[PDB]
Ligand binder design. Structure first.
Ligand SMILES: C[n+]1cn([C@@H]2O[C@H](COP(=O)(O)OP(=O)(O)O)[C@@H](O)[C@H]2O)c2nc(N)[nH]c(=O)c21
Lengths: 14, 179
C-alpha cells in the first residue's frame, strides 16, 4: 500500500 | 517504478455539480479530470477554482476511479459518511482549509488498511451553510468507520468537541456514530 505523509505530500508541490 | 512522479494508491476522479433545473440530479454530475500521482494532484488543485468560490447549489467531489459520487453506485448504496458542518460565514476562512486536508487524507491513504473503505469526498456550497463529508462503502463496518472518523477529526484540527456525526446514505435519502 502506498501511503503519504501530510508533510511529504506538501513537499511534493515542488 | 522509477519515481519521476510519485504514484498514488488509487486513481482519483474530481467531479463538479451545477444545481441545474432541467436534468435528473444524476445527469448533472460532470467530471473534471482524473489523476494518479501526487504531482498531477497538485497541478489540478492549484489550477481549478477553490471551493470557497463555488456558487451556491454546486459541489466538488473526489472519488476513486469507477465510483460515481452518488448513492446508487454499488459502492455507496450500503455506505454513508462523516459530515462536517460550516455556516456561510466560515466560507472564506475555513472551507478551502478543511477541503484540502480532506483531499490529502484520501490520496494519501491516511486511514491505514481502512482507506479501502473510503469511496470519496464531497463539499457542498449552499446559501444556508456548507458541507464537507467523507463517504465510506459500508455503514456496517464499525471498526473501519470508527477509525476513519477519529483520524479525520484529528486531521481537521477540530476542537475537543465539535462532535461530528456519521449517517448512512439510506437515512439521508429518506447518527450511527459520533467523534
Ligand atoms: C447527493 N445527492 C443529492 N441528491 C438529490 O439532490 C438533492 C439535494 O441534496 P444535497 O445536494 O445533497 O444537499 P442540499 O439538500 O442541502 O442541497 C437531494 O434531496 C436529492 O433530490 C441526490 N439524488 C440522487 N439520486 N443521488 C445522490 O447521490 C444524490
Amino acid at each position: 500500500r502506498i501511503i503519504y505523509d501530510r508533510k511529504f505530500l506538501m513537499e511534493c508541490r515542488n | 517504478e522509477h519515481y519521476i512522479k510519485h504514484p498514488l494508491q488509487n486513481r482519483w476522479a474530481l467531479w463538479f455539480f451545477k444545481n441545474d433545473k432541467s436534468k435528473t440530479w444524476q445527469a448533472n454530475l460532470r467530471l473534471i479530470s482524473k489523476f494518479d500521482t501526487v504531482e498531477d494532484f497538485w497541478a489540478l488543485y492549484n489550477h481549478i477554482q477553490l471551493s470557497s468560490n463555488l456558487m451556491p447549489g454546486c459541489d466538488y467531489s473526489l472519488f476513486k476511479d469507477g465510483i460515481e459520487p452518488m448513492w446508487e453506485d454499488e459502492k455507496n448504496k450500503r455506505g454513508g459518511r462523516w459530515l462536517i458542518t460550516l455556516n456561510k460565514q466560515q466560507r472564506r476562512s475555513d472551507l478551502d482549509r478543511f477541503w484540502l486536508e480532506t483531499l490529502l487524507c484520501l490520496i494519501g491513504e491516511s486511514f491505514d488498511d481502512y482507506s479501502d473503505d473510503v469511496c470519496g469526498a464531497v463539499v457542498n456550497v449552499r446559501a444556508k451553510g456548507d458541507k464537507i463529508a467523507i463517504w465510506t462503502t459500508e455503514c456496517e463496518n464499525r471498526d473501519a468507520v470508527t477509525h476513519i472518523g477519529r483520524v479525520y477529526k484529528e486531521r481537521l484540527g477540530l476542537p475537543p468537541k465539535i462532535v461530528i456525526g456519521y449517517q448512512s446514505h439510506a437515512d439521508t435519502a429518506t447518527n450511527r456514530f459520533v467523534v
